Design a protein around this ligand. Structure first.
Ligand SMILES: [Mg+2]
Lengths: 297, 5, 258
């Protein structure tokens, strides 16, 4: 069954751990393999793999990584994924001295928002959008990947896991301990990633839960009942939070033009209900002149 | 509980 | 935020047809019957209460069992093994904190081993080819609840209740789609409590009218009248708790005027 793949190199490590670039010997196709170990005597197949596999089978989209196949033994679970050149994070690093060109960014964001809208419209939440989980090919595509943390949701949502989203990209509603979060969390992550594509550094690189809140407050200004009705009644909100004036988006991400900035603030809204949806965001004037250029790899 | 007894 | 409200409902409608079990599976099952399946679902309900599992989880597990039994012959001695893994799978998909494998072994009084439960789990995933994200009655009802004027907790809890009773009886509810059963239940709950009807806004949302629901409603209505005499009583008991506004104690309406 692994009969037809020749491994090439390891290309990364996740929660099931080992990921290999491999080649279908008969078709030529280059695949990524996630290898999940079982050895009966545990708790069977990990919930993360159950979800990853069942949700990706439904999510067929050019801007979502394609699960090509699931291969069994009684001792090993293999996930055959379409293979992809690089992750966004390894790319931002290499653009150190050139920057990333605005139409590359614009294209990327637009594609990210498409794939995100497809997820949200199939009642799937990603819950770990970050640049390392976003893969880019040589033809100019970018795709959501790693559905390890993803989950099927309901309308209206109920309480789901709290311990959620890589810190740097976590939405203020999760940090403030809200019992209910929805699609708006993924949007918060792309907003962060947007900013990060512009400046090539993290918008909010905190070290702990409270550090991260206060970084967010220091940029967007501490929220009140005006900006975010119901904030002050949130489990983890404290009346002693320092009250910081909002800045001035022209200074949060200075190279951004007016449409750029309008978009990011819509993505970085405090109130999960005012925060723009991926669907809506595709119509934004930021995207009028968008194309799909190749990058330099 | 064992079911089909 | 009803953010992707229509889209999702539309997607659930398409998926419910593809995730539908075979309506006749029980005729082709040599060693099991409708009442044995009733006995398993009843027991799965107790398991959910015992382990404080979501309602979505129980509904999901049932869908697995029926789909798995739509294609695999199972012996009386194994129907419960299938039942246990179905639940373990449901919990892993749906629950923030699923019970450990051991717990599922334990709630059988150790009929089967851990080794067998994981092997069944594997076998169940094989047969479902991992399609676990199935629309359920609980998923439709929850959206419909957004259409009430205004929110009524009794209406909700009693809808869950009836939605839940339908799980128990293959004949007839295996022939009604999740969305229709939810239709029957929501309407049935609303009328019982406030005396009112399937709202015109859900006719717009779903394309169902009282008329289209009549058949499933006729069945649901009998199931309700006869509830307290059913051989299976775990849902009724479950629905006595304050957690559900004791809705199982309310009186079924004696007529539906349709
Ligand atoms: Mg990844």
């Amino acid at each position: 069954s692994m009969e037809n793949f020749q491994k090439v190199e390891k290309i990364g490590e996740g929660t099931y751990g080992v990921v290999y670039k491999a080649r279908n010997k008969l078709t030529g196709e280059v695949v990524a393999l996630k290898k999940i170990r079982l050895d009966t005597e545990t708790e069977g197949v990990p919930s993360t793999a159950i979800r990853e596999i069942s949700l990706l089978k439904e999510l067929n989209h050019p801007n979502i990584v394609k699960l090509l196949d699931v291969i069994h033994t009684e001792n090993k679970l293999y996930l055959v994924f379409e293979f992809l050149h690089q992750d966004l994070k390894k790319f931002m690093d290499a653009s150190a001295l050139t920057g990333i060109p605005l139409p590359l960014i614009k294209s990327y964001l637009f594609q990210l928002l498409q794939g995100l809208a497809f997820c949200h419209s199939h009642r799937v939440l990603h819950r770990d959008l970050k640049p390392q989980n976003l893969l880019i090919n040589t033809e100019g595509a970018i795709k959501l990947a790693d559905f390890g943390l993803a989950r099927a949701f309901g309308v209206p949502v109920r309480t789901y896991t709290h311990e959620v989203v890589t810190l740097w990209y976590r939405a203020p509603e999760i940090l403030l301990g809200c019992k209910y979060y929805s699609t708006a969390v993924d949007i918060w992550s792309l907003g962060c990633i947007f900013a990060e594509m512009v400046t090539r550094r993290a918008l909010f690189p905190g070290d702990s839960e409270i550090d991260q809140l206060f970084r967010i407050f220091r940029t967007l200004g501490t929220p009140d009942e005006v900006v975010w009705p119901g904030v002050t009644s949130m489990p983890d909100y404290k009346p002693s939070f320092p009250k910081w004036a909002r800045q001035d988006f022209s200074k949060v991400v200075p190279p951004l033009d007016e449409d750029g900035r309008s978009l990011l603030s819509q993505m970085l809204h405090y109130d999960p209900n005012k925060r723009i949806s991926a669907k809506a965001a595709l119509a934004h004037p930021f995207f009028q002149d968008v194309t799909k250029p190749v990058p330099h790899l | 509980r064992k079911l089909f007894d | 935020v009803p953010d992707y409200h229509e889209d999702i409902h539309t997607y659930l409608r398409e998926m419910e047809v593809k995730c539908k079990p075979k309506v006749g599976y029980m005729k082709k099952q040599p060693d099991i019957t409708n009442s044995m399946r009733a006995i398993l679902v009843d027991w799965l309900v107790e398991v959910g209460e015992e382990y404080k599992l979501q309602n979505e989880t129980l509904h999901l597990a049932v869908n697995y069992i029926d789909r798995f039994l739509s294609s695999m012959s199972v012996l009386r001695g194994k129907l419960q093994l299938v039942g246990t893994a179905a639940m373990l799978l449901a919990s892993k998909f749906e629950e923030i904190y699923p019970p450990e494998v051991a717990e599922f072994v334990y709630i059988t009084d150790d009929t089967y081993t851990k080794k067998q439960v994981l092997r069944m789990e594997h076998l169940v995933l094989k047969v479902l080819t991992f399609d676990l994200a199935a629309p359920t009655v609980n998923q439709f009802l929850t959206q419909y609840f957004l259409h009430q004027q205004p929110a009524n907790c009794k209406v909700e809890s009693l809808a869950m209740f009836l939605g839940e009773l339908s799980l128990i009886d293959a004949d007839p509810y295996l022939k009604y789609l999740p969305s229709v059963i939810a239709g029957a239940a929501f309407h049935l709950a609303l009328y019982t409590v406030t005396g009112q009807s399937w709202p015109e806004s859900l006719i717009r949302k779903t394309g169902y009218t009282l008329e289209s629901l009549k058949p499933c409603l006729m069945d649901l209505h009998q199931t309700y009248l006869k509830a307290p005499q059913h051989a299976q009583q775990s849902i009724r008991e479950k629905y006595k708790n304050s957690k559900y506004h004791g809705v199982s104690l309310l009186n079924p309406p004696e007529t539906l005027n349709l």
